[PDB]
Design a protein around this ligand. Sequence first.
Ligand SMILES: [Zn+2]
Ligand SMILES: [Zn+2]
Lengths: 550, 550
Amino acid sequence: GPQDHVEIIPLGGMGEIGKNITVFRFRDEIFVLDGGLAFPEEGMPGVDLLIPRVDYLIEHRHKIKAWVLTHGAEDHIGGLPFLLPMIFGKESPVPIYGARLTLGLLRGKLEEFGLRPGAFNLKEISPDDRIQVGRYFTLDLFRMTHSIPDNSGVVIRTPIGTIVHTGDFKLDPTPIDGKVSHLAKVAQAGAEGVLLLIADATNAERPGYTPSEMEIAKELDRVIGRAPGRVFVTTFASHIHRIQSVIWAAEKYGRKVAMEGRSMLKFSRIALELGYLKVKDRLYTLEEVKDLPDHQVLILATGSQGQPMSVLHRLAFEGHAKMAIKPGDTVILSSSPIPGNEEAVNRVINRLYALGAYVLYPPTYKVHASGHASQEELKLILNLTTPRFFLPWHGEVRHQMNFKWLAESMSRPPEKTLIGENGAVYRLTRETFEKVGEVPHGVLYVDGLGVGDITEEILADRRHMAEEGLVVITALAGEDPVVEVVSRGFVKAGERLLGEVRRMALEALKNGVREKKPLERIRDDIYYPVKKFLKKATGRDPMILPVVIE
Amino acid sequence: GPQDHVEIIPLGGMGEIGKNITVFRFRDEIFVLDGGLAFPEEGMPGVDLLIPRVDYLIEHRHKIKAWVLTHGAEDHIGGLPFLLPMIFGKESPVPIYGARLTLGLLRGKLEEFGLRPGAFNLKEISPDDRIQVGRYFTLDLFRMTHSIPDNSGVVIRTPIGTIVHTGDFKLDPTPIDGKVSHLAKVAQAGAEGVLLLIADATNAERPGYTPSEMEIAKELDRVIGRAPGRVFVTTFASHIHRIQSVIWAAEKYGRKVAMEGRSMLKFSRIALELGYLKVKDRLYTLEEVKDLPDHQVLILATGSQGQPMSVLHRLAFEGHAKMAIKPGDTVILSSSPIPGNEEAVNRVINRLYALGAYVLYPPTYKVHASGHASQEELKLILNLTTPRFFLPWHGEVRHQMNFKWLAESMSRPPEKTLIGENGAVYRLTRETFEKVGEVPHGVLYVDGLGVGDITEEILADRRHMAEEGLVVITALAGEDPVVEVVSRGFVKAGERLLGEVRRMALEALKNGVREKKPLERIRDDIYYPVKKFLKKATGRDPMILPVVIE
RNA sequence: UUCCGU
RNA sequence: UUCCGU
Ligand SMILES: [Zn+2]
Ligand SMILES: [Zn+2]
């Protein structure tokens, strides 16, 4: 039938790295792939995290047959304690599939955001399971090597063809868990024929292969072993395999492992519980590790991206009542700086050097590997699948374009490659693939209070104040009119002209009472001429607040 | 005599990259080495540039025997149109030494900042000249290869020993000007014995050698030659050799060179005038180059660091009335992103890819080389000089420490290495080198209006507004007390509590008039309890403005 | 490809 | 190791 088609709507994850959320539909049965979280750092202060706009999912909260989860990373399972209550409400019998860790981390996230255990249907599946979603989707999951364990891809079987979603991946030949990528299901999918391939474009510009976690472990061992006195190690909290090799090194060289920072304390607790982490002794605290000699200590902490309030940031910018950087410690930044955090990292790195600690970080020391596949690995999957259509995902426009070209360079290139966009509707038939339009989409600013606390406008005029400053005018209606101009964060060129604005507003108030105009209309007779005067006089566009009282 | 000593005071350039300014003194004769400029990007909005605090130079404007300039880059000659008028005033007969370009660029900078030609004594010298400053300092200048031409180092001969200041450098074996580094004067200095070595620490962490500009030229030629249609090229305006090789490539492949952005338009004009740039034809404009076929055009522009208002930024974020990015153009970012501009660059890169232009940048394409020396070159100078004392400069704490270790790894390591700091006093004798204290130092925020327009406090409370938002309260004294609370950029948790603050201030005003307290004291009886309430209620510290009128 | 002070 | 719209 030429009427049959699959609608693919990503509400996040395209033309970007974070907030991964993919929606798949056939006729009237919907299935969602992941519920991601995004981070600010661009120019959004106060905001802790970000969540995608599921306006499509509120509208279709019934057609949602199941929610499938690839892995337990925040950019895949962080949005859910905010997305789930918005869609279904406090409870839902809709199955939410995932691996032990993928769900265990989510469980804890719900235990954090005030939730009854099992309010939502969290159905545990193997990273290699086959799940029949509704009556149109047969989901063949397959293990994929990445930063977080129990990560999977998905061979999405539809009544019109095969969608191969690689998910976040790398072809790590020697992963820390020994649990290698199941390329068999993928090679099997290719033979049958692949209609669409959704592939991780993170390092599509990066040539060659991504170094194995085993090689990073080997290096970490070499440096931790080398260490004179103390050893500090930072990484992304989520990276259980890295945490593992850092532990494996400490244990090898007779060091007791301490752990600080709630994020790493969270992930590890769940991982050690579910048998993903392996400590021969106990994961000590700072209190316990305190008395021990320097060469017998390893303090694992949060602050890989030089986070303003993290443990490593406090260690650099004094600090803790319990811990301070001693001139002798070895600080191992087992991560590479994320773009836009490069300066935050530099300040931290510099600060630690200034304190007297030897700082070890990439590229000098090969102590970090990307969880995402480089060109050679993408080249392999592209040959393994040979799709008709291609949708590069989990990557910015640069990455998606470079992957488009990498796919183009192939022997049997795809018939059509589409650069993915958030909230766009992609119609896929057994013969065609095309964007058929758009749906309501965006992002929601979340903080300590939650969603709705910070709107688009709160930051908008906050930027207006940041970039330009504030000028506040107090206008008094009545027989005795008073005008007072005060300005915070305003240019000295304008502070001189503050005397002129008082008289500029006094005559504007004078005419206001003369015409017996309302206070809501007098403010505008004050606001606009001062605005036009300040732009023509100082060239600055500051925040102007004309307060009108009787 | 054990009383004889040289005081070395850097007012900028240490523990950082920009605003290079070094002060050298013996008895009562001072000489200044460079007058640098710094850039914001950390978290300072509106600010265009930054200048060092010459409070030492105001106090000693007479002992200043001469001002020596190493090269014409802004981080070496940018502060001067602000520093010179502060120190000596509108005119001075104090000699300001420099090479043709070094002074020509300064000339134009003075022609820009309202100055009579020759108000200051700009004495032209060769990058290899010997200048007798006052009666204690014999300055042996020596050519050094770097990004900007006519760059020099200085073998500072004092009545107590030899100071070798390498200045900004790299050992480019094949520079674009063919004018190689004069290591002879340096090797000669070493034989005699080097007391102190002031060396460029920019790439002290970087192993090996910095690639030659000739190799970058060769690559630029390969890519510009390869190009299908249009070619756009961005670099630091200052980089005349790069501009040269980009021209050399266009000319080779029959392309006409256009030039946009005032910064690159400035440097090139002065360079083409003084015989540093070489165009076989004329440096066309966008107007002239408009009609020409795509494969016969090269538009050189500003925006190497994805600058918010630059030509390349406008080309990406539409844009110009004259020029727009066509899906076919080749964009060559002939620069590497400076830390903290990495995101600005990414937005630009992404935007251009989105428009349909092939973007070529490092590391994929070897189109940029650091103007600063890597380990092998520093290793060579360290062996060439073999100093007693060492002061790593033109680099952050990471760089200075790594250079300290690179100096330590040597055969004949220095007796003492000191990590440089701004406004610190370094006393050097024929036998010792030590920090003997500090002097008033810092930085001055400059913009379109100049110095004094933006203070430390303007940005301080501007940050308070950015990070937290504003809450403005209007208080009215008199028989009828009125309280009105308005808040811009405030959290929805606090917007609900705005009703509570009205009543919180109304009772504070009530007691204020009851006690007949002054308006200046009533505001504080309003300010503090609301401050303590907001912190205990919303956990936020916003900008609070209690305006008190009668 | 991040964090969230006795 | 930066920029500053007909
Ligand atoms: Zn991910
Ligand atoms: Zn410089």
